[PDB]
Structure formats: structure tokens, C-alpha cells
């Protein structure tokens, strides 16, 4: 059961092209896992800064896993094909996944698990688009950045985990 997972690496997810991806392929890499939307007021700053972080630190082992999610103001209403094209407009080269739920019993189990990494049981629901979890090379959640935090806030924390 997902509650007992020790690492992101125990999970799998469908990429935005529909193919199952074993997330243990990220073993040895530092990852930013984020829920994205195309019609949010935060969309422009988040895509632009995620692409910038990936441009400068991918060669060092930074990977970004982006999960579309329509649960926050219905701001990701498009199909996966439409979302893939939207991300291409920002020159996204990191890893896009198929649209999921991040809250609810139908939420992707990776998200169920990340939300409980330390703490209390109440109030761990994802609050809006563009929450960011930082994942170390062993697949552990080491930081959470709320949807108010611009991605470039993360840059200063990266050296502790590379
Ligand atoms: C891109 C990259 O690998 N940079 C880099 C430089 C120096 C160190 O050692 C501190 C590390 Cl882990 C990564």
C-alpha cells in the first residue's frame, strides 16, 4: 500500500504520451515534482522558471516531473495532447505526465504518499496549482514549496542534495 512506500522510486506513472514510466529511473537524480495547469495566473511564472531551472541544472542531475491537474479552478481543462503542445510553447524539456488527480481517493498514489511525508493527518491536501515537492536522489521528499513559492526559490536549496 502507498502509505508504506519509502521512496518515490516505488511508484509508476503514465507520461503525457500515455506510456507507463517506472519512477525508479529517477534514482540518483534530484527531482522537482509539481502539479501544473495551463490557465492559472501562476502558469507563466511557473513554467518559465521551471524551464530555467532545468536549463541550468539538468546537466547536474536535476529532473522535473510535471503532473497536469484540473482540480484547482478547472484551470487544466484540456486534453493531454493539448497540454503537451502548451508546454512545448514554453520550450519544456523536462518530463510531462498524463493529467491526474492529486486529491481524492482516485488521486495518483505518488501524490497521496508525498502529501503525508513529514506529521498530522489533517490539512495535507494540495491547495492549488503549482505545489512543488523536492525529492532527493534516494527518492525521499526533502522540501515542500507551496503554490505561492516561485520555482527559483528552490535553487538555493539544491546544493544540499546534489
Ligand atoms: C552540473 C554538476 O554536476 N555540478 C556539480 C559541481 C560540483 C559538485 O560537487 C559539489 C556537484 Cl555534486 C555537482
Swiss-Prot record:
GO terms for biological process: apoptotic process; arachidonate metabolic process; cerebellum development; chromatin organization; dendrite development; lipoxygenase pathway; long-chain fatty acid biosynthetic process; multicellular organism growth. It comes from the Eukaryota. The keyword GTP-binding does not apply. The keyword Cytoplasm applies. Keywords: Cytoplasm, Developmental protein, Dwarfism, Lipid metabolism, Mitochondrion, Oxidoreductase, Peroxidase, Phosphoprotein, Selenocysteine, Transit peptide. It is an enzyme of class 1 (oxidoreductase). One of its GO terms (molecular function) is phospholipid-hydroperoxide glutathione peroxidase activity. It catalyses: a hydroperoxy polyunsaturated fatty acid + 2 glutathione = a hydroxy polyunsaturated fatty acid + glutathione disulfide + H2O; 2 glutathione + H2O2 = glutathione disulfide + 2 H2O; tert-butyl hydroperoxide + 2 glutathione = tert-butanol + glutathione disulfide + H2O; cumene hydroperoxide + 2 glutathione = 2-phenylpropan-2-ol + glutathione disulfide + H2O. The active site is at residue 40. Its EC number is 1.11.1.12, 1.11.1.9. The modification Phosphoserine is found at residue 7. GO terms for cellular component: cytosol; extracellular exosome; mitochondrion; nuclear envelope; nucleus; protein-containing complex. Present primarily in testis. Expressed in platelets (at protein level). Monomer. Has a tendency to form higher mass oligomers. Interacts with FUNDC1; this interaction promotes GPX4 recruitment into mitochondria through TOM/TIM complex where it is degraded by mitophagy. It is linked to Spondylometaphyseal dysplasia, Sedaghatian type: A form of spondylometaphyseal dysplasia, a group of short stature disorders distinguished by abnormalities in the vertebrae and the metaphyses of the tubular bones. SMDS is a neonatal lethal form characterized by severe metaphyseal chondrodysplasia with mild limb shortening, platyspondyly, cardiac conduction defects, and central nervous system abnormalities. Essential antioxidant peroxidase that directly reduces phospholipid hydroperoxide even if they are incorporated in membranes and lipoproteins. Can also reduce cholesterol hydroperoxide and thymine hydroperoxide. Plays a key role in protecting cells from oxidative damage by preventing membrane lipid peroxidation. Required to prevent cells from ferroptosis, a non-apoptotic cell death resulting from an iron-dependent accumulation of lipid reactive oxygen species. Belongs to the glutathione peroxidase family. This is Phospholipid hydroperoxide glutathione peroxidase GPX4. It comes from Homo sapiens (Human). The lineage of its organism: Eukaryota, Metazoa, Chordata, Craniata, Vertebrata. The chain holds residues 34 to 197 of 197 of the full protein.
